């Protein structure tokens, strides 16, 4: 009851950005920054059936797999269904109590453990969850401050928001502390856009029929991700190239130590869709722009990074 | 009894705009700007008294569509018979500064979002209105089903109703983020000939004269519109659009700076209603371009002559 | 009993306007301002007596043999369910039927609560369908604020009391009031003959009202005059037409002449006048050429 | 129970025989209930069909205020106690010489220690006061006010800026009501000057001095 | 739920400065500059730095507090905590934390910053990259990762634990105090703590004027806004 897998073709790099956040949860997140809404909610919801039916336990508000004492918060840890993903968005008008529950009264974040908490126009929210939500992912749990009550039930999510350049982006406080940064371009190919309208008509002609048109293609895309689960083991680079990765920043590593460490793990994922068991050279260059471009403070951006990348690796 | 559906005597363009939206349920957003809310209320009554009968089944509060679609998974699906029923149109307009809980409901108590299965929803002086529940209502246009989850609830009232917008310009434009989802938005301008309005004023007195002879005054004229609209309803699927002409449509909006082709997408579908009204099956390039330009004026962020000048040499001039 | 209608001295403009609304329900409505009414209730109690008895409230608790009820009317309240009704329990909006109520303390009132009054003209029923055809008299308060960009624009005969000194007149009024309050006995007879003639004239005018005559072609001048001003929601022509009809069925002249404009320009235009009287009169004279 | 103290008692006595006049709006007061009890001494809801009530707006009080003129279920009650609520009033003390305090202290000792057998101290005046009230009652609906004098009275409103003028009508009737205990055939400044600012301080828009200065200009 | 304090490296003097006021009850908040992804990590590391809040009064007696550049924080406490600093009673031992780009606090607060600390940036992350790998090693089974460094961490509880019960064995030299007047008094109230600082500084290890000379410029900038013959 949604758009197809490769729907709204064009955000191929964006599809890759979404894939980058997938599989590996240590990336941190993403910040959608484009011209307008453009119906990006479908692109946000494009990973609806993409998530497998992760195993379920009982029917608690928090989405929890069975067993896993590390994932058992209060009752399952002392007590002794393969539910679909439930990624949700964040209402504009909201309060801190709305993101919690006065116990045991739960909260929206707690009920959405291990999910893609969608968000858009984050520039509107001032301070309520600017650092509270950013730091929540690192903790991995939802602590309570209700006097004696202090339940710290585990909290897991994806934490990838969105916003519009018109209302600004942020006073830089946790933007470096946030995940990778990316944006969107302007579609100038009317013929390509014409097929999108045809694709919309294809989506409108018969949702189920259209689905049967590319149903086998949908299965193939999910196949690489499932096998990529085992790809996390090994892939141990000699770190000899990673030695120069820090030296690559140099003038561009003025501040944000934390950021440099994180980009290193990206290469393993970068050399994971390609299937290479060893470290693939030039993949850092393919991810250098998507690494700390927004985090790189300034007054040629990518072009300047590319010019700097010439001395960093040698080309 | 209400004033005649042919008592508009003006705003032909606004009248034409409202009729096309009636024909295609997925047309989009409809709104009218101006300084005469009473005029919008007048059109509201005229629009309400501008449709054939619709069937219900027995008693369903939200909607009792007699087994037309499979969207009866609620109680009717269990019951899938007291179904020999067919009601008429019914408008709906929420009071200003209403209650969100009343707008939503609880559990199951039905909220204010339980009006006609389609259309009916209308909003006068929506320029002020409120920020909360407005985007949800804008999103409710494509919702197709309610979202009830209070205290762990789970219910989805399958309703899909069009909306009509009205608000005085003195209150200012809405938020640009919320300003989107505007399929059609225009304004109505008066004339400096009270003499001409005096006829309608005299007609208003004739309208206020007696309900007798009021229906017989234009019943044959009124019957023509019902037959023409119903005729296009059956032939609506037979729509022919030229891809080469369709290619020009995006090329037409090449210098539009739409900041998102969402508006241009449904803009192509706009000419379908004009073709259905015309009766011609093949797309007429000129008519299509004109309709698209007229509809895109509201979404054109930054007059229509410049767009018309832009339309010149784009569609071919 | 209360003070007689003719016993009231002053506010002749208000008296002329108030009678028009009762004369024809078509009348849009009057609105009145002016702090320190000092008898505002009596100023409206006059219309209560001036009404022929009609068969009303016939064994129906909504207002077999039919009793020719003389008259009935309330003024105003000090809950919304109490204002309308309950579910079938009728509320305060269940007695104004075939009557009229004042708008006392509407300067404060309550937004989104006093709106059913505007949404009450030509109701014909309720929504439980209780017919409603009540009249309304606006009672505003000066210096108490006027937040009605177009909310009170619905007002038709907008006027207010503007007495200044009237020293000898005030003394005479006070003396007459004291005399009337001392003993209504024979105070009724002091002016009894006058009320009957007025009641008969009003009844005759109401009876002959349907045979009114006018001329839209002649009213083209009024249309042009309205065009000279600025309007947004119209209804000005309707107000002018109703005022002209009342003026025709106010002196008995079964025709149309250019005097209703001079009689009711202030009463009609000022209600929706742009945000004065002298300028409106000058414009009307220039348009008419007089 | 207190000798003298006619600064505020005189208004109460004048209003005692003025059922048409109404509106007690006070804003000393240590006696409070005791002062009310002192008022009940100089006197013989449902049972209040013919009586007086004391006040210790909204819904009940606002309805109670209009129930004065709408004293019919007959009420006929005498009330004791924003600009809109100010209209329901026609009449609106002082707690410093130690000599007054010494007399009060001695009276307080006389009252508290000698609650009994102390009636004869004020009984001769209080008992005779009933005849004075009775004498004023019989001739109450007999006196009249001069229209030529009323012109001077009406002239007071010219400089006055308080709207409504209902109290002014009452004030014109107030002077005629007064002087009944006095027994004089007509009413001189005695009734004019004293009762001028008596009700004027309540519905006022130098609180009294300016009014008195205008009154002095208005009066001869 | 703990991290090895000694695992982090760089600006090790700050940890000693943190260790200087770790068991000091008459010290109070100490200024510490250097705000970045690092500062947050170090603060969390400070919490997990030794066993036996930050930026509620009953559960606050005798507790440290990590500031967050209070210049940008609420002024209600700023107008109060500044005077509440060294108030005497209702206790707590906060720690001034922030950055020049993150604010400069208040001038009275600037006039009394206690000990002054800062954190700089160093290139050639030879050890930092290994620390990043150690953090990755810390990421890989943190319950087991801490166990690898646990024996070293285990041999740290009694490093200075018994060095504070009988720490005030001696007192600052009177002649040394007069020598402070040449620079410290010539260029106050903060000097009184610096005067007894050497007793606190040279106590944890096994109980010297070299530490005092080193600590001479440790908090000079906090009061500035050779004396010991150096």
Author numbering:
A (entry chain C): 14 to 93, 102 to 124, 137 to 332, 338 to 353
B (entry chain B): 14 to 93, 98 to 124, 137 to 331, 339 to 353
C (entry chain A): 14 to 76, 99 to 113, 116 to 124, 137 to 176, 184 to 331, 339 to 353
D (entry chain E): 20 to 46, 49 to 65, 142 to 153, 159 to 174, 186 to 194, 204 to 214, 217 to 219, 221 to 330, ...
E (entry chain D): 14 to 65, 109 to 111, 141 to 175, 189 to 285, 290 to 309, 313 to 330, 349 to 353
What does the article say, verbatim?
Magnesium chelatase is a conserved enzyme complex responsible for the first committed step of chlorophyll biosynthesis in photosynthetic organisms, which is the addition of magnesium to the chlorophyll precursor, protoporphyrin IX. The complex is composed of the catalytic subunit ChlH, the bridging subunit ChlD, and the subunit ChlI, which serves as the motor that drives the entire complex. The motor subunit ChlI belongs to the superfamily of AAA+ (ATPases associated with diverse cellular activities) proteins and, through binding and hydrolyzing of ATP, provides the energy for the thermodynamically unfavorable reaction of Mg2+ insertion into protoporphyrin IX. Here, we used a combination of cryo-EM and functional analysis to investigate the mechanism of the ChlI motor subunit of magnesium chelatase from the cyanobacterium Nostoc sp. PCC 7120 (hereafter, Nostoc).
Our 3D classifications revealed a class corresponding to a pentameric structure of ChlI, which we attribute to an intermediate state of ChlI complex formation. The ChlI pentamer shows a spring-washer-like helical organization with an opening of approximately 45 Å between the first and last monomers in the complex, which would be sufficient to accommodate an additional monomer of ChlI. The resolution obtained for this structure allowed for the fitting of α-helices and β-strands of ChlI monomers but restricted the accurate determination of bound nucleotide molecules. However, the cryo-EM density obtained contains areas that are not occupied by the polypeptide chain of the ChlI protein and are close to the nucleotide binding pocket (insets 1–4). The three central monomers of the pentamer contain partially folded insertions and generally show higher local resolution. In contrast, the two peripheral monomers are less resolved, possibly due to the increased flexibility of the ChlI pentamer at its ends. Of note, our pentameric structure of ChlI also contains nucleotide molecules bound between adjacent monomers, supporting the model that ChlI requires ATP for oligomerization.
